[PDB]
From a paper:
Here, we report the structure of the catalytic domain of a soluble guanylate cyclase (CYG12) from the unicellular green algae Chlamydomonas reinhardtii, which shares 40 to 50% identity with the soluble and membrane-bound guanylate cyclase catalytic domains. The 991-residue full-length CYG12 protein contains each of the domains present in well-characterized soluble guanylate cyclases as well as an additional C-terminal domain of unknown function, and has the full complement of residues necessary to function as a homodimer. Each guanylate cyclase domain contains a central seven-stranded β sheet surrounded by several α helices.
The three C-terminal residues of each monomer are disordered, as are residues 564–566 in monomer A and residues 562–565 in monomer B. The final model of the guanylate cyclase dimer includes residues 467–563 and 567–653 for monomer A and residues 467–561 and 566–653 for monomer B. The model also includes 8 phosphate ions and 99 solvent molecules, and was refined to 2.55 Å resolution. During refinement, we observed unexplained peaks in electron density maps around five of the fourteen cysteine residues in the dimer (Cys 499 and Cys 592 of both monomers, and Cys 621 of monomer B). We wondered whether the apparent modification of the cysteine sidechains might be due to the addition of dimethylarsenic groups via reaction of the cysteine thiol group with the sodium cacodylate [sodium dimethylarsenate, (CH3)2AsO2Na] buffer and dithiothreitol reductant present during crystallization. We will focus on one active site, and refer to each domain as monomer A or B. In the C. reinhardtii guanylate cyclase described here, the catalytic residues are the metal-binding residues Asp 482(A) and Asp 527(A) located in the β2–β3 loop and in strand β1b, respectively, the ribose-orienting residue Asn 599(B) and the transition-state-stabilizing residue Arg 603(B), both located in helixα4, and the triphosphate-positioning residues Arg 571(A) in strandβ4a and Lys 640(B) in the β7–β8 loop. In our structure, the corresponding residues are Glu 523(B) and Cys 592(B), which are situated close to the locations of their adenylate cyclase counterparts. The modification also results in distortion of the β2–β3 loop that contains the metal-binding residue Asp 527(A) and the base-recognition residue Glu 523(A), causing it to adopt a conformation incompatible with binding a metal-nucleotide complex. Comparison of our guanylate cyclase catalytic domain structure to structures of the mammalian adenylate cyclase suggests that the guanylate cyclase catalytic domain is in an inactive conformation.
Author numbering:
A (entry chain A): 467 to 563, 567 to 653
B (entry chain B): 467 to 561, 566 to 653
Amino acid sequence: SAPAQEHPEATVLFSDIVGFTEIASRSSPLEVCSLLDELYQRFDAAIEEYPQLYKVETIGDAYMVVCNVTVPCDDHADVLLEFALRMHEEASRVASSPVRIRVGMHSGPVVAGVVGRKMPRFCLFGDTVNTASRMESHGEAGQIHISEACYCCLRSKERFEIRERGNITVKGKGTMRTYLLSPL
Amino acid sequence: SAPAQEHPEATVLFSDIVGFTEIASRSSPLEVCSLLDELYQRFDAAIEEYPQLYKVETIGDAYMVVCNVTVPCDDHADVLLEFALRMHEEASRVAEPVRIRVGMHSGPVVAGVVGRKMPRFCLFGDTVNTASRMESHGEAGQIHISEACYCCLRSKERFEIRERGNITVKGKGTMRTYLLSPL
């Protein structure tokens, strides 16, 4: 199995259910798990249309997606970002007791490779991955929180319409600029 | 595959490298990654002696182990606490030396498979989230365990567990916790 490689510029997304602990508040844990799995399967079937993208369902419930690590792209930020929008509408296709997500993206260097022996897994590693994770957990319900590194990697700023700025700290650095994007 | 199941009592352990940012900043990402995989292979080698245990190296870098979800194991907190002392040992033979922060908690865990073309064994719930918080809220070079996990421990007397006390834990409110130092 090939060694770990460092992709100089890829775009990583995280997504998470809004009000999950509250939804699980009034449901069985097996009820909420199959609610999680249902939403996962809608993402996996919408991601049929986005081949450049790689996704892993993560411990903690976050859905992760990556672009330009599987296949090269350059266009990655843009393709990933449109998929973010698809995620949002596919989130409302699976109601509960309807479902909203929070999405974060970030662009940067990403190390990828295999860990484990009997039980191997593809691994996505580094500061880019970690920051994209705070992007999502510091982002806004129903919206798409994207970093400055990611905004700039867009090859087609002009058809997305990103006006709202924000910030994020995250504790690992100072304060970075971010952009919000509603999907309405 | 069999559907998801709720296991009414299991123990979950998360481990993290202490000051990873200090290590990464002052060297390369492909190298630090090798540091990480070095550690994992040592964990992965020690854990073959602990067949009750199932491990998962997680997307954020945390090494995660669970007991009583795969093979029935009634002293699941005991076995896993013991493996946590082992992890601290395996960590001190990686380079100076690497230190880890370990956290543990016990409770119900849902387990099942998610995904199709690439299925994943999934461990899900409040117990897993809390165990993770036991790690983030713990202490470098030590093992930090919840009261629930102390309770499930059958052989309280085999470990030098000290009561830490009441700390507040993100999302959880007040929890009573315990520490155990290796060495």
